[PDB]
Neuregulin-1 (Homo sapiens), 118 residues
Amino acid sequence: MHHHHHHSSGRENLYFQGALPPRLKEMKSQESAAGSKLVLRCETSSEYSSLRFKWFKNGNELNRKNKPQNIKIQKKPGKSELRINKASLADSGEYMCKVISKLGNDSASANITIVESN
């Protein structure tokens, strides 16, 4: 039976003195041709057992429905990447990776610029 499991057992959601915040590692502003593939690789400095990764574009939360279908979002165990396949001019803008945990929140951005290969 599809049941999520994994209880969000909170204790250190503001009193985590000693433990580090989930600091995302800075992604790159990448320029590429229309029809190319750009992978935004965003992970935390230290891996944690409760990292909720989210992708935004101009502050708009890219859910499965809000996400353009040429892009495929992959949430790996403790990291997440944004594989923008056949990236067109419609894929231009800042894609922000986000992390939501007990220890805190953090966000790294990347300006995806696409040009027509003339």
